[PDB]
Amino acid sequence: LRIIWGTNVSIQECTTNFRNFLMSFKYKFRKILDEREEFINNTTDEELYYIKQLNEMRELGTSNLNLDARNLLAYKQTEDLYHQLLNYPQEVISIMDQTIKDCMVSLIVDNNLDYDLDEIETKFYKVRPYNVGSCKGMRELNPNDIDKLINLKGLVLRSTPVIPDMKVAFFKCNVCDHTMAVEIDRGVIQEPARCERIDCNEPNSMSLIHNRCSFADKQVIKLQETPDFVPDGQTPHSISLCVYDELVDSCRAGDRIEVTGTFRSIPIRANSRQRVLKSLYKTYVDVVHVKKVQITDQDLAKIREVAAREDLYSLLARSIAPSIYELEDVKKGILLQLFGGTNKTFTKGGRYRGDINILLCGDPSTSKSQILQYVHKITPRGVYTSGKGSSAVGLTAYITRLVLESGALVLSDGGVCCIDEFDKMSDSTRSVLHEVMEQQTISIAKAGIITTLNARSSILASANPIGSRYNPNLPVTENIDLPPPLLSRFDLVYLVLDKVDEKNDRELAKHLTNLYLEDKPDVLPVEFLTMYISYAKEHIHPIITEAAKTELVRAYVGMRKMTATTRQLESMIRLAEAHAKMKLKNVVELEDVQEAVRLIRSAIKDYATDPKTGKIDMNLVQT
Amino acid sequence: KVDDVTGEKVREAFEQFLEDFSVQSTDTGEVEKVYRAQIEFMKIYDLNTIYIDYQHLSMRENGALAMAISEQYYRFLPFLQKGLRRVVRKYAPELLNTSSPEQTERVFQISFFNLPTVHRIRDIRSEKIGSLLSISGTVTRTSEVRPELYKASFTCDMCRAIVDNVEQSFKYTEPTFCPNPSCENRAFWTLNVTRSRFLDWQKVRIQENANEIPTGSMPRTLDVILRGDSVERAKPGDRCKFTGVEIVVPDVTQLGLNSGVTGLLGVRDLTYKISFLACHVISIGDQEVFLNSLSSDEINELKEMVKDEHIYDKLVRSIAPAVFGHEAVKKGILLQMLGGVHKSTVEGIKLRGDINICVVGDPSTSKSQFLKYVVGFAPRSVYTSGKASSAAGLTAAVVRDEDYTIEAGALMLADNGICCIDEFDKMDISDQVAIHEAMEQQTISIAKAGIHATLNARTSILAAANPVGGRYNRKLSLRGNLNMTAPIMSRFDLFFVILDDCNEKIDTELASHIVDLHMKRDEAIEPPFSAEQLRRYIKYARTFKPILTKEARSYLVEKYKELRKDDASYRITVRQLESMIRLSEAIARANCVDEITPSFIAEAYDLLRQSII
DNA sequence: TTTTTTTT
Numbered sequence A: 001l002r003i004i005w006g007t008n009v010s011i012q013e014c015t016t017n018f019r020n021f022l023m024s025f026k027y028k029f030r031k032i033l034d035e036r037e038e039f040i041n042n043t044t045d046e047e048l049y050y051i052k053q054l055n056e057m058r059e060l061g062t063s064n065l066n067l068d069a070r071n072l073l074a075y076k077q078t079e080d081l082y083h084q085l086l087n088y089p090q091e092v093i094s095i096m097d098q099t100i101k102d103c104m105v106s107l108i109v110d111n112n113l114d115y116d117l118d119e120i121e122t123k124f125y126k127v128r129p130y131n132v133g134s135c136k137g138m139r140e141l142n143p144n145d146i147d148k149l150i151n152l153k154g155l156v157l158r159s160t161p162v163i164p165d166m167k168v169a170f171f172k173c174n175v176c177d178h179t180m181a182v183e184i185d186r187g188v189i190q191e192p193a194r195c196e197r198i199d200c201n202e203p204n205s206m207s208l209i210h211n212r213c214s215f216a217d218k219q220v221i222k223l224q225e226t227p228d229f230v231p232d233g234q235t236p237h238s239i240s241l242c243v244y245d246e247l248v249d250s251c252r253a254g255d256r257i258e259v260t261g262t263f264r265s266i267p268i269r270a271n272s273r274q275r276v277l278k279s280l281y282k283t284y285v286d287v288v289h290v291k292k293v294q295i296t297d298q299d300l301a302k303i304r305e306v307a308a309r310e311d312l313y314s315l316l317a318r319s320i321a322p323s324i325y326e327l328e329d330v331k332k333g334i335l336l337q338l339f340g341g342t343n344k345t346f347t348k349g350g351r352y353r354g355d356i357n358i359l360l361c362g363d364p365s366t367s368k369s370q371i372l373q374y375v376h377k378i379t380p381r382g383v384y385t386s387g388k389g390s391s392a393v394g395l396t397a398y399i400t401r402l403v404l405e406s407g408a409l410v411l412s413d414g415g416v417c418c419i420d421e422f423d424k425m426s427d428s429t430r431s432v433l434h435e436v437m438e439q440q441t442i443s444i445a446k447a448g449i450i451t452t453l454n455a456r457s458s459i460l461a462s463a464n465p466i467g468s469r470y471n472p473n474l475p476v477t478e479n480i481d482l483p484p485p486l487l488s489r490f491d492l493v494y495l496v497l498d499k500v501d502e503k504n505d506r507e508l509a510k511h512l513t514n515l516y517l518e519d520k521p522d523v524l525p526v527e528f529l530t531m532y533i534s535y536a537k538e539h540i541h542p543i544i545t546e547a548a549k550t551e552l553v554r555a556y557v558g559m560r561k562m563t564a565t566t567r568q569l570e571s572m573i574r575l576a577e578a579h580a581k582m583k584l585k586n587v588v589e590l591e592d593v594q595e596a597v598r599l600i601r602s603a604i605k606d607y608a609t610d611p612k613t614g615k616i617d618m619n620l621v622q623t
Numbered sequence B: 001k002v003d004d005v006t007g008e009k010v011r012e013a014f015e016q017f018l019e020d021f022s023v024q025s026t027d028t029g030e031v032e033k034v035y036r037a038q039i040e041f042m043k044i045y046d047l048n049t050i051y052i053d054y055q056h057l058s059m060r061e062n063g064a065l066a067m068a069i070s071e072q073y074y075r076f077l078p079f080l081q082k083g084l085r086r087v088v089r090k091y092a093p094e095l096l097n098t099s100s101p102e103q104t105e106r107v108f109q110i111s112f113f114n115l116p117t118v119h120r121i122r123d124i125r126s127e128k129i130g131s132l133l134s135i136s137g138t139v140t141r142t143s144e145v146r147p148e149l150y151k152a153s154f155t156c157d158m159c160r161a162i163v164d165n166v167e168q169s170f171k172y173t174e175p176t177f178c179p180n181p182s183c184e185n186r187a188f189w190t191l192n193v194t195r196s197r198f199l200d201w202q203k204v205r206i207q208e209n210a211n212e213i214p215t216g217s218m219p220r221t222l223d224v225i226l227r228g229d230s231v232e233r234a235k236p237g238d239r240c241k242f243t244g245v246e247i248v249v250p251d252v253t254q255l256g257l258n259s260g261v262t263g264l265l266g267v268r269d270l271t272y273k274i275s276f277l278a279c280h281v282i283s284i285g286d287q288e289v290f291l292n293s294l295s296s297d298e299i300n301e302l303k304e305m306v307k308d309e310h311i312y313d314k315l316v317r318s319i320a321p322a323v324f325g326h327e328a329v330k331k332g333i334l335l336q337m338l339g340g341v342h343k344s345t346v347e348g349i350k351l352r353g354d355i356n357i358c359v360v361g362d363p364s365t366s367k368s369q370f371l372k373y374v375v376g377f378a379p380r381s382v383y384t385s386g387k388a389s390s391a392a393g394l395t396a397a398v399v400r401d402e403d404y405t406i407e408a409g410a411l412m413l414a415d416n417g418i419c420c421i422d423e424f425d426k427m428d429i430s431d432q433v434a435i436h437e438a439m440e441q442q443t444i445s446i447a448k449a450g451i452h453a454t455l456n457a458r459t460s461i462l463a464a465a466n467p468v469g470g471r472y473n474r475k476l477s478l479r480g481n482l483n484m485t486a487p488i489m490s491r492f493d494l495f496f497v498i499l500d501d502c503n504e505k506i507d508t509e510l511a512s513h514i515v516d517l518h519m520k521r522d523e524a525i526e527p528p529f530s531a532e533q534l535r536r537y538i539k540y541a542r543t544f545k546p547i548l549t550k551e552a553r554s555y556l557v558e559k560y561k562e563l564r565k566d567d568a569s570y571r572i573t574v575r576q577l578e579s580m581i582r583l584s585e586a587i588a589r590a591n592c593v594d595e596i597t598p599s600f601i602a603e604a605y606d607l608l609r610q611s612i613i
Numbered sequence C: 001t002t003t004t005t006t007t008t
């Protein structure tokens, strides 16, 4: 028979059970295991999930099979195999991959489909199991956990460039030239003492020809343990997980990803010259599967239905920060920034990103920081930090080993960034931020390190007026006291004020008190909301409109006529673009421009802003 | 030995592709066996390397040979070289020998060129190891050419048996067993340097291009290796494509001269490092001689815009097509790009002909886009932000690599070309002084770090600053409206100060222009000339050497007197007259006139007068 | 030397 050493896990019985789990495994098994009998759909449930996946996989011709734990736990034959994998992954996964390969071969031959059986025989079919176990704190790991799949969550601190992973050794005789290939067993080579040709059998003439030898691809990624898992006692740990094969270079830095992989430990040479190994063992993990943090026709239908709703604008605005009371205009602005404008990358004149930049300067206690926390949570690529705890070097780029470290902005490139207490943040680091946001790119100029980097990301700044409470006596510009260039760089500026409105105070107190009532206290499903925003960004592409352009011209002429920098024009342009995107419009409209101007005036409180003196009438503010 | 019948079949097909290719476009499809003709030229010049188009071998024999070689280039290379030697014997037996004392075997370098595609640095994969590929990128670092020991020779220090033709691995290799069967010397192999043949070698480093994988990533870098004629074939800091094979570099220290493979090394492990061995290198990034370099149609077009007399205005219009307005500023670009006649007086004092422009505009004036166009459209052009920049990285840096050495800074990176300086206002005052002395000297000397080296550092500087407080106070003076050392002010040729205007008509025009720039994107712009056409004309003008004229001497002296009176000298000095002469030279170059014209001096005088404001 | 938080 075929059994796994030290486990009493019969490889033959394992193969038979996993085969029956491959064909004759209805998704009904999974759903019933998950109960949800009110959500069972015959087609999906009665479908042999894995057989359909294998058919679509042959159609795609890929050799990788993502696999959840629940499917194994649903099939009685493979329910035991689930625990077998949990205990002794490597062997189980190897047997399982072989079984998948054989099942594909059977499917092509059984279905007599015109397919290259050699290709499938050549296709190294693999299984990428996921959900193997409940996500456990990495710090919680202990030695006995070694040799087991450990579902893990974390943030990608950094990743190494791919490394040649020696695969099969190739030798050659130095007297008769006869060659032989030694496969790397257990990461070691057993060189032939004498020539494989007994005719020659020359001792030590067999030499390893590095170039002729076979190598694989390996990469390693540092993954930070999430703050949820770690305790207050100490800083989060990180593990340099070793990735291999296609999984290599399958994630950038700052990627909130959940990964399942076997827990691995190895010796380490105490003295490189000698074979003496330190008693303690280096520990790593081999990710068999990676989870990052397709819009189904049903999902698209829901998206378009919500788009049909007129409240879409205000509905999303409230949905992004459901707990926040009021502040609908600020919510709408940040919602637009989440949507972002259109990135018309002109072949000439450079690229023109449709980015949106919103600063929040106003009297404190206004939840601005809480709003920043929300924004960071929402954006899939979020970067939260505070100026005081932030450094310009660490913000954008940090020299290292000679090598460079990505800064906070770099970790936001293609995402949203949050800089709390932006006013407190140093003026020098402010100047650093100026050009990078202006060009959406980091320019580096240092001894031996001189280059530029992509920094296309939105920033959500939170500031406080020079006077702790915004002083209407001081002009708005004086109240903020920020560089006029920097001021222009930002697209929107909400001047939140704590006007003493007994009615509004009553209502906000009601909100907060009600929250207090429920120990654990409409709005879109944040997941569905994110899907909406994504689909809009990727598929929808707003384009300027004739009426829109005419109105923009007239509006900016008025602005400059009343200062209206050209960046103001680009700001309203990108804002109308993001509005159309919010409306799932690939074409801009006059109404988008009108909304852009309206919100521009709102955030600056232009309605209450004094026509002269640069001040704002607090009585006019919120009337 | 191992038959490698496939290897010898590839050898035969390769010699037949080298001799019987029978393809030539000259005289239409008339076949010349362009590889046989290349062998004939080889005999004419008696080189070593053979240039081979990949596409030629692809059309050859259905490209099955191309496929086989492209995968197993490493395995097939000895067979290909042996077949090349066979072909040489067939047609150029003289070249078969190096060609007085005995002439040794001549090594032929089969440098394939014109590959089907170029794979990016990140596209590199272990699967491609040993396969012939081509890689693009800029040369961040290079090495001094050094003599790699291709074929080794050793005299047996116990019997005097001399060994030769010993190929060396990554680590210095030595004979193991004496060829003399009578002798049994396994060491003591005094390397016969004379017998051994060393090939030239050079390490070169490159980095990922901006538009390669800019998405949230640091530009990956590769260590390519130049060998044979390829050594030094390319200049540093230039985007170029390198065709060759992917070479895995084992760590020689482990070889003995995560863990690594062992049990061979023997007990020792081995860790590798991927790299690339370039076979052929191609870059992708006099007046009459320049014309010769041009194509016939190119020369005709040159003559065409030469004939145009509005050409000056149309060129100024072409400058920064995206940028609207600020036409005098675009004129400043054009003039600085044209440069001026640099001359060293009879006494030897060097007189700079280059022009260093400065711009002082409020934020949103598009000065950023201004510099972006400048550098993008300018060769030997370096762009940097003054806020974030290091002096050494800008001028030159000292680093230790086996051992103190030097690294070029921006000035070096763009010496003899444009030097864009963005966010100059934010630039460090001490670094500003470093530039001041460097640019004024048109020379950079690394006196520190023990070494006292010096480099030409000749170039033109496009300074870009913003007025103090983010706005230029017209009541104040330029000197004071912006933070900058007055002596450096003295040696900035120009000062384009950009102010804001509430002209409603101009506001409407610019708003419409921008909105069209977004609506129609690229279609919105329409310069009179193509950037390549513009560069060709510009270089042609560079070829010209303006000469001052009697009327021009006069007009100049009166105009300088008038300027001195106008300041009546905080901004008027002899430096201003020098800049006047340089501007006259630049205008004449734009006019493509070897002589100066009082009209040119009038234009320059108006330019400087406007700069004075 | 160069870059670099951090304290002095």
Ligand SMILES: Nc1ncnc2c1ncn2[C@@H]1O[C@H](COP(=O)(O)OP(=O)(O)OP(O)(O)=S)[C@@H](O)[C@H]1O
Pocket: A323, A324, A325, A326, A327, A362, A363, A364, A365, A366, A367, A368, A369, A370, A371, A462, A463, A464, A508
């Ligand atoms: N409109 C609001 N809705 C809900 N909570 C609010 C609102 N305004 C203020 N708060 C609360 O007031 C507190 C202020 O928290 P912060 O986020 O620090 O306020 P802030 O606007 O960021 O001003 P700072 O941070 O002190 S400069 C939080 O507990 C918020 O929940």
Ligand SMILES: [Mg+2]
Pocket: A365, A366, A367, A368, A369, A370
């Ligand atoms: Mg707060």
Ligand SMILES: [Zn+2]
Pocket: A173, A174, A175, A176, A177, A178, A195, A196, A197, A200, A201, A202, A205
């Ligand atoms: Zn042998």
Ligand SMILES: [Zn+2]
Pocket: B156, B157, B158, B159, B160, B161, B178, B179, B180, B183, B184, B185
């Ligand atoms: Zn000997």
